[PDB]
Amino acid sequence: DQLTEEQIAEFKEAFSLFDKDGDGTITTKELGTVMRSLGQNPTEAELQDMINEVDADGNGTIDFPEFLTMMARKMKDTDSEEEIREAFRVFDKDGNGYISAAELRHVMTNLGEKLTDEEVDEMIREADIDGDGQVNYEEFVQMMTAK
Amino acid sequence: EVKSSLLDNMIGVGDTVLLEPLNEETFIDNLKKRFDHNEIYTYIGSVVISVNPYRSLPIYSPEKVEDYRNRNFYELSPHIFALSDEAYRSLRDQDKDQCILITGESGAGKTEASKLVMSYVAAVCGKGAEVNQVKEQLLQSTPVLEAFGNAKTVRNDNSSRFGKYMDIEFDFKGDPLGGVISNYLLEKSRVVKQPRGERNFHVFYQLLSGASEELLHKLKLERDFSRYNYLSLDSAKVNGVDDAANFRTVRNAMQIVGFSDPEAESVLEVVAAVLKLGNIEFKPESDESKIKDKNELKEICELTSIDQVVLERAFSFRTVEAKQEKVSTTLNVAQAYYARDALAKNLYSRLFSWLVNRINESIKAQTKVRKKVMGVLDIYGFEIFEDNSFEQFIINYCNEKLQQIFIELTLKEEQEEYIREDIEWTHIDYFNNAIICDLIENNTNGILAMLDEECLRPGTVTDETFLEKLNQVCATHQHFESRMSKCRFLNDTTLPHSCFRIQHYAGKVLYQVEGFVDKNNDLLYRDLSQAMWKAGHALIKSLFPEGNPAKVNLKRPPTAGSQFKASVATLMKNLQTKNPNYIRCIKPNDKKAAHIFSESLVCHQIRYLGLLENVRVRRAGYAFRQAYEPCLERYKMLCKQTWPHWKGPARSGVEVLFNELEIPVEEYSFGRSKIFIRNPRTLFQLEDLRKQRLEDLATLIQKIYRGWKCRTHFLLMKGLNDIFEAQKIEWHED
Ligand SMILES: [Mg+2]
């Protein structure tokens, strides 16, 4: 395995924070949450793949070394700030760097692996700093990619 | 910079130039698809096709005007406002006269398109009451001109038998000065004869249906269609048409546009006179024509205060020109009937002109100040009936002329673009309207010229001698056919006698020669005009100013053919000295139903309008073209290099994107400022790829959001974990 010792410890801390039962495992339903908590950004499809591989024995549970196997896959991957930025600019018909919550709702609720109604509800509020004059996605992305 | 495109959320093909493969079935299906989704507008490049919805679509709002105003043609989905925005801005910024030509089958849809244009312009020019006063006059006078200029044919219950131009005029500052209505090509022959199954102009039926008993008594009219030779009982009823109610609607429009009650009444007295003239008959004497019964003539002359002795002599004697010893030529019976008819139809067409002139008075510019105009030209649609006569010939000829200059100009402009972009021209095969026009209008050997020559020659003349003359002179023409002219064993039904066929841009048309000679006779000679001028009836007197002794007599045109030909030239001049745009109107069914779509009828109309030839000449070599920068912008997410911010110059990026998508270098060409794509397949492959990639970009954003959300909350828990782990544990103690 290629993970460094510091990574292993960092992932271990998060793995345990979602190990409610203390049996040294976590549920398949919590897999994405733990991955996202550690700063990885998996799609719902990719998530389904990883579960399909580990739950091919029908248990619904994941232990730490197979979790490390899961975390290792997307390790070298990266999405730039500009990619996420330009991806926003594509759904913006002006060049203003602004997009309407109505339009944003449209894209999130209809395109791709769709955001749920409660999720798209929550997204607007974080995105609408100067509430409720619509979202300056440049700032929203700036905050979102803030590391 | 705006990234909106007609390509976005496009229902079927929004611009027919992108239809592939191009045929009638795909054209018609496309129009049906869009119509079925409430899209009544579809492009052919800049040309707008409009299918009548037969219901009020909420798509003409101030908000919709705000959407299309000052926007590029290709940025929004197809709408008439795009065309009217284009025309308004050319007027405003270039000080160019605009003429928007509207072709196709007459009805409520064509009238509405014209009203939409004028109303968009009034709204957008921001001149308020001055511009709306002109606009109102143009619009409210429409039912008046319909009553006098429209008729039920075998194909259309409310068909325009004339061409109409309307404009709003401005000074170069943009201040409204006025406006005008101009009529052309009024089908005078319908006044005195109608084919079986057809009516005379509406107003005659409206008058006998809706006038009170007292009014009809004052007009010396009997309330009975069988009493008037000029009207048939047989076709007098049009289904779903209440002529009485329409009468009241026409009288009310008259008042609205400023006619006084005495004027309105005067107008109806002229209509009555026209109608009564049709009952005059003639018999030979030993002096070879005499009126059979003087009763209609008497009543006409009392109605109009015309000298009965003089009018009667006018039908039977013609004053020959000085300076010979003979002063009066005796008219025979046939000549007397021609006279009766010439008087009726000219009294009628002059009434029609008078109406237009009256309406024009209140919107007359009355300043010699140079002006720029926003015009709409409405020309009657192509006609291919079971029986095609003189009437269809003139209409089709006019449509042929227009298609000619249109196709020529579209071809010439596509070429000028290709050159500016350094793109190779490929010869386009297209129907040659020019030679058809030449067959019809050539002064030395054309059909109209031969008809004239036949009508004026001193021998015995019939529709047959006319046909025989065409067979002699026009047989050399590739596109003229008749039984005795030609031909190749190609399964053609044999042509009957007494007809000729013409290959028009809209298809072959078979013309029956029956009545051609009669209908070409249109001689209103001086004795008639002078009898009219001396009428105590003010309107009628005014209708024949050449009859005033104070006005010097000129040579009178003896035939209709030559006048119609000059009138076609006039309207063409009007069009060609202005900047043109085009609305092609289509009826989706004949039941006037809101969703019902008949692909059969639309197919005929597609042919009448010459749309397929428009598509081919307009598409030309390359269906699509676009400036490099906006093109790259729209498709840069396709290859994973241009994404998210390159390559180099917009042109470079285009090349590399196409190379990486494995698009063969024969499917496109590099213009001086634009990429040029040959086939709509290429364009749509790009579009399907983009639509997939937008689904990916959505996921990119969505995964980044779900990720940032959990990450933030996790960092919160981590920050407070000391407190959380201290509260799970006791206060005290050992
Ligand atoms: Mg005179």
DSSP state of B21: S
Q: How was this structure obtained? A: X-ray
CATH assignment of the domain containing B643: 1.20.5.4820
Bond prior to B647 in cis (omega within 30° of 0) = yes
The domain containing residue B703 runs over which residues? 624-714
- DSSP label at B22? -
Cα–Cα distance measured from residue B638 to residue B690, given in angstroms and rounded to the nearest whole number: 6
Interface of B with A (CB under 8 A): 1-4, 637, 643-645, 694-711, 713-714, 717, 721
Residue B648 and residue B49 in contact, taking contact as beta carbons nearer than 8 Å: no
Interchain pair B711, A39: CB under 8 A: yes
- Exposure letters B283-317 (e unless 16+ CB within 10 A, then b): eeeeeebbbeeeebbebbbebbebeeeebbebbbb
Contact yes or no for B248/B210 (Cβ under 8 A)? yes
N- to C-terminal Cα distance for chain A? Answer: 26
Tokens read off for B505:
């841009």
Distance CA(A42)–CA(B704), nearest Å, equals: 8
Three-state secondary structure call for residue B152: coil
Q: Give the DSSP H or E segment for B168.
A: strand B163-170
Gap between the Cα atoms of B539 and B535, Å rounded: 9
Interface test with B, best of A37, A71, A120 (most B CBs within 10 A): A37
The gap from C-alpha B545 to its chain's centroid, in whole angstroms, comes to 32
Contact B380, B145 (CB under 8 A): no
Two tokens, residue B422: 């350094």
Residue A30 to residues A45, A55, A74, B373, B556, Cα–Cα distance (Å): 15, 13, 17, 71, 99
- Tokens standing for A98? 């602004």
C-beta separation of B106 from B159 below 8 A:
yes
The pair of three-digit structure tokens given for residue A108, joined into one six-digit string = 């999130």
Q: Give me the DSSP letters along A76-137.
A: T----HHHHHHHHHHT-SSSSS-B-HHHHHHHHHHSSSPPPHHHHHHHHHHH-TTTTSPB-H
The alpha carbon dihedral of A70, A71, A72, A73 has a sign of positive
Does the CB of A29 have a partner CB in chain B at under 8 Å?
no
CA B181 to chain centroid: 15
Contacts 24+ apart (CB under 8 A), A28-35: A28/A54, A28/A55, A28/A60, A28/A61, A28/A62, A29/A60, A31/A62, A31/A67, A31/A70, A32/B706, A32/B710, A33/B710, A34/A67, A35/A70, A35/A71
Which phi and psi (to 5°) does residue B35 adopt? -60, -40
Determine the Cα–Cα distance for residues B392 and A7; give it in Å rounded to an integer. 88
Do B504 and B486 touch, CB atoms closer than 8 A?
no
Token pair 């102009």: residue: B201
d(CA B64, CA B45): 21
Collect all residues with Cβ–Cβ distance below 8 Å to B164 and sequence separation of at least 6.
B145, B149, B181, B182, B183, B184, B377, B378
| C-alpha torsion angle, residues B578, B584, B585, B588 (rounded to 10) | 180
DSSP B190-203: HHH---TT--SBHH
Q: CA dihedral defined by B87, B90, B92, B95, rounded to 10 degrees? A: -120
Closest CA to A100 of A140, A137, A143: A137
Contact A95 B645 (CB under 8 A): no
E strands along A12-89, which residues? Answer: 25-27, 61-63
Asked if B547 and B530 count as a contact pair (C-beta separation under 8 A), the reply is yes
Q: How far apart are CA B591 and CA B28, in angstroms?
A: 19
Looking at the complex, report in whole angstroms how far the Cα of residue B69 sits from the nearest Cα belonging to chain A.
16
Does residue B464 carry a catalytic annotation? no
Cα distance between residue B374 and residue B125, in whole Å: 11
- Contacts of residue A43 in chain B, CB cutoff 8 Å? 699, 702-703
- Residue B394 CA, chain-centre distance (Å), reads 15
Beta carbons within 8 Å of B534's beta carbon, 6+ residues apart: B306, B307, B310, B541, B547
- In chain A, residues with a C-beta closer than 8 Å to the C-beta of B705 are 115, 119, 123, 144
Report CA-CA distances (Å) from B444 to B33, B416, B489: 49, 35, 32
Cβ distance B500 to B481 under 8 Å? yes
Tokens describing residue B24: 């009638």
Helix, strand, coil abundance in chain A, percent, nearest 5:
55, 5, 40
Q: Is the CB of residue B389 less than 8 Å from the CB of residue B178?
A: no
Other C-beta atoms lying within 10 Å of the C-beta of residue B437? 19
Give DSSP secondary structure letters for B382-397. P---SSB-HHHHHHHH
The continuous run of DSSP H or E covering B728 comes out as none
User: d(Cα B515, Cα B102) in Å, to the nearest integer?
Assistant: 30
- In SS3 terms, B172-191 reads as CCCCEEEEEEEEECCCCHHH
Active-site pick, B12, B14, B45, B107: B107
Partner residue opposite A41 with nearest CB, options B694, B696, B703: B703
Contacts of B622 (CB under 8 A, 6+ apart): B423, B669, B676, B677, B678
Q: For chain B, how long is the longest CA-to-CA vector?
A: 154
B111 is catalytic: yes
The owner of tokens 């801390």 is A13
Dihedral (CA of B309, B312, B315, B317) sign: negative
Residues 6+ apart with CB under 8 A from B526: B319, B547, B553, B556
Q: Report whether B140 contacts B253 (CB < 8 A).
A: yes
In the chain, the amino acid numbered B86 is E
Mutation for testing the A interface, residue in B1, B9, B643, B711 having most A CBs under 10 Å? B711
Whether B696 sits inside 8 A of A112 (CB atoms) is yes
Cβ contacts of A23 within 8 Å, gap of 6 or more = none
Whether the bond into B21 is cis, omega within 30 of 0: yes
**CA quadruple B638, B644, B650, B651: dihedral sign:** negative
How far A44 CA sits from the closest chain B CA (Å)?
8
A115 class by beta-carbon count within 10 Å (0-12 exposed, 13-18 middle, 19+ buried):
buried
Whether the CA torsion B58, B60, B65, B68 is positive or negative: it is positive
What does the alpha-carbon distance between residue B423 and residue B193 come to, in Å, rounded to a whole number? 56
User: Based on the number of CB atoms within 10 Å of its own CB, is A35 exposed (0-12), middle (13-18) or buried (19 or more)?
Assistant: buried
Q: Which two tokens stand for residue B398?
A: 């006019």
Residue pair A88/A141 in contact (Cβ under 8 Å)? The answer is yes
- Minimal Cβ distance to A90: which of B694, B713, B721: B694
Q: Residue B425 and residue B609: Cα distance in Å, rounded? A: 26
DSSP string, B681-696: HHHHHHHHHHHHHHHH
Which pair of structure tokens corresponds to residue B160?
A: 């325009």
Residue A27 β-bridge partners: A61
Cis peptide before B143 (omega within 30 of 0): no
Q: Which residue has the tokens 């002064």?
A: B443
Distance (Å) from the alpha carbon of B24 to chain A's nearest alpha carbon = 35
What residues contact residue B123 under an 8 Å CB cut-off, 6+ apart?
B62, B65
A21 known ligand binder: yes
Helix axes A137-144, A117-127, angle to 10 degrees: 100
Q: What are phi and psi of B580, to 5 degrees?
A: -95, 145
Interface residue A122 vs chain B (CB under 8 A): yes
How distant is the alpha carbon of residue B378 from its chain centre?
4
Task: Give which of B375, B377, B376, B373 is closest to B169, Cα–Cα.
Answer: B373
Residue A13 has a CB neighbour count (10 Å cut-off) of: 12
Closest CA to B698 of A97, A60, A45: A45
What is the CA angle B294-B300-B306, rounded to 5? Answer: 100
DSSP run (H or E) holding B460? none
DSSP B566-595: HHHHHHHHHHHTSEEEEEEEE-S-SS--SS
How many angstroms does the Cα of residue B550 sit away from the middle of ligand 1? 6
DSSP B91-132: HHHH---EEEEEEES-SHHHHHHHHHHHHHHHHHHT-THHHH
The per-residue b/e assignment along B513-544, b for 16 or more CB within 10 angstroms, e otherwise, is bbbbbbbbbbbbbbbbbbbbbbbebebbbebb
Question: For residues B653 and B598, is the Cβ–Cβ distance under 8 A?
Answer: no
Angstrom resolution of this structure: 2.3
Listed in sequence order, the residues at least 6 apart from B254 whose beta carbon sits closer than 8 Å to its beta carbon are B144, B263, B264, B267
Angle, alpha carbons B307-B308-B314 (nearest 5°): 95
Q: Give B559's DSSP letter.
A: B
